[PDB]
Write a new protein. Structure first.
Ligand code: QVK
Ligand code: MN
Ligand code: MN
Length: 366
């Protein structure tokens, strides 16, 4: 069984024994004292603790292989002229097939971000959105896959105009720096300081205007937990907490030609149940029904309004507002820098395994 073009064969069909390709394996960086952390690669104790979690790493790898094949497919057809809805539906249809969607056991970890220009994150079109991808747009494709709640959070920036090439290079270099400097016992702020230094070393010229690339200071990388996109630890992308063994990180950076600060803008499309909210009894019929739809289909995973529409749900906006007002569900509105500014993003999921650092979502693309 080999992959077709367009991809349609599930990843678990391409690897019947359920052993999926490893990501990029990295030796841990040397500590601030000068001593190498290379011993972990050959430590018999660390090798044992690593094989104990083999099923876990293996679920991330399946989800990461689905991510590589879905993004390679998107890159071959994403073009100006397409509506944002068309782009998201074509990507998600492929993602559902390759991950072999199965309720909460395999599926889409979160909505397809396709944030444009000054908007950096958390924009996906709602029903009726007529936005069309333009030749001069700088589009952030940020989509997720999961196997048993082992989430792949991985993203890249799409452009058609070479005027953004050095802005893309700056952010790609900064993400790769963040990835290189991450490791067991490394302070989160040290990863952030390294990201910022690389980012700000770049100057770009776009349409006769020049800018020094700014990291978006209120956007950050994060630890990932089972069915939990943000497990609680923050990886700043600017200058106390340490990364720990067995942890999973989304290393992401955003570079901007604006203020380097995002604000809540436009209408909301992304929502997610607050992970720490227990069972809340609801009597309001439409609100009760919507929370049941959310619990059954998404659990603590992020969703968007288009995903409620595809489930046959209608007249749910007040119900959704009630869930947000009760603090059961949190809205995640688009995050945008100033009008006329340009933002780019690159993101990978990394596994802090006992033996090595695995950039599980690494591809031959980025
Ligand atoms: N951490 C993320 O990269 C992330 N990705 C998402 C996708 C959809 C939704 Cl609804 C939320 C997120 C979040 C996030 C952001 C800050 C606090 C908690 C989660
Ligand atoms: Mn992401
Ligand atoms: Mn993320």
């Amino acid at each position: 069984k080999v992959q077709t073009d367009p991809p349609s064969v599930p990843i678990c069909d391409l690897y019947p024994n359920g052993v999926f390709p490893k990501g990029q394996e990295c030796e841990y960086p040397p500590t601030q004292d000068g001593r190498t952390a290379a011993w972990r690669t050959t430590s018999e104790e660390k090798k044992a603790l690593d094989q104990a979690s083999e099923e876990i790493w293996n679920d991330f790898r399946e989800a990461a292989e689905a991510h590589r094949q879905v993004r390679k497919y998107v890159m071959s057809w994403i073009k100006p002229g397409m509506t944002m809805i068309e782009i998201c539906e074509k990507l998600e249809d492929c993602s559902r097939k390759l991950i072999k969607e199965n309720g909460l056991n395999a599926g889409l970890a979160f909505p397809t971000g396709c944030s444009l220009n000054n908007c950096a994150a958390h924009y996906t079109p709602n029903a009726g959105d007529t936005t069309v991808l333009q030749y001069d747009d700088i589009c952030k494709i940020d989509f997720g896959t999961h196997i048993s709640g082992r989430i792949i959070d991985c993203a890249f920036t799409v452009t058609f105009n070479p005027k953004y090439d050095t802005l893309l290079k700056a952010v790609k270099d900064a993400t790769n720096t963040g990835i290189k400097c991450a490791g067991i016992d490394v302070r989160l702020c040290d990863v952030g300081e390294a990201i910022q230094e690389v980012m700000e070393s770049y100057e770009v010229e776009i349409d006769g205007k020049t800018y020094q690339v700014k990291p978006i200071r209120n956007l950050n990388g994060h630890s990932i937990g089972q069915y939990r996109i943000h497990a609680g630890k923050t990886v700043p992308i600017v200058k106390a907490t340490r990364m720990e063994e067995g942890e999973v990180y989304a290393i992401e950076t955003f570079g901007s030609t604006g203020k380097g600060v995002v604000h809540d803008d436009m209408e909301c499309s992304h929502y997610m149940k607050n992970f720490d909210v227990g069972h809340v009894p609801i009597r309001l019929p439409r609100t009760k029904h919507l929370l049941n739809v959310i619990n059954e289909n998404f659990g603590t995973l992020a969703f968007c309004r288009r995903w409620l529409d595809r489930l046959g749900e209608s007249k749910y906006l007040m119900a959704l507002k009630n869930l947000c007002d009760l603090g059961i569900v949190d809205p995640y509105p688009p995050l945008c820098d100033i009008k006329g500014s340009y933002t780019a993003q690159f993101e990978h999921t990394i596994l802090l395994r006992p033996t090595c650092k695995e950039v599980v979502s690494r591809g031959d693309d980025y």
